[PDB]
Amino acid sequence: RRGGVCGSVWGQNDIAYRCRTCENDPTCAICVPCFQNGDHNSHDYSIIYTGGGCCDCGDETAWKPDGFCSNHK
Amino acid sequence: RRGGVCGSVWGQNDIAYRCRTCENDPTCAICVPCFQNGDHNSHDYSIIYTGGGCCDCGDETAWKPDGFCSNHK
Ligand SMILES: [Zn+2]
Ligand SMILES: [Zn+2]
Ligand SMILES: [Zn+2]
Ligand SMILES: [Zn+2]
Ligand SMILES: [Zn+2]
Ligand SMILES: [Zn+2]
Known part of the structure; x- marks a missing residue:
């Protein structure tokens, strides 16, 4: 849509995704x-x-x- | 990213930002x-x-x- 960084915060043992193709x-x-x-x-x-x-x-x-989600472009 | 307080120090006449929405x-x-x-x-x-x-x-x-920058979360 028309119109942000996600910025969502993890605690110590929270899971996320590593993407070696998209990471800086x-x-x-x-x-x-x-x-x-x-x-x-x-x-x-x-x-x-x-x-x-x-x-x-x-x-x-x-x-x-190209690795951003639909909501943070 | 994965992984701090900023702690950067001001002198007497150094400018900064007051944010009344984010301040304690x-x-x-x-x-x-x-x-x-x-x-x-x-x-x-x-x-x-x-x-x-x-x-x-x-x-x-x-x-x-919610007022922290990308580097101090
Ligand atoms: Zn996110
Ligand atoms: Zn990727
Ligand atoms: Zn996103
Ligand atoms: Zn700072
Ligand atoms: Zn603010
Ligand atoms: Zn900061």
Whole structure:
């Protein structure tokens, strides 16, 4: 739609998605909802325990824009 | 990303941002970089001369967490 960074926050043992195809570096990650509302088919992704932090969806400095979800473009 | 308080220090006449929507009390403030890397759209913020002190971004005791920047969550 017309018109944001996700910024959703993880606690120590919250899971997220690592996508090695979309990440700017090895510490980037996106929340499960942003992963499920994007397109990572044939990407090299894995479920991870975050150790805390925040989702990088929407942040071009941390995540490749073709990897953004429908809500953070 | 995965993984802090900002703690950046101001001198007497250094500017920072007051955000009345995010602050825990009237003496809190965040540095310009933390302001620019957060989301305060439609918040009641102002540029101020600090009189010294330190940025509250990342410190839940001084600043509402939805007001933190991308680097201090
Ligand atoms: Zn997200
Ligand atoms: Zn997203
Ligand atoms: Zn991907
Ligand atoms: Zn700061
Ligand atoms: Zn910050
Ligand atoms: Zn604010």
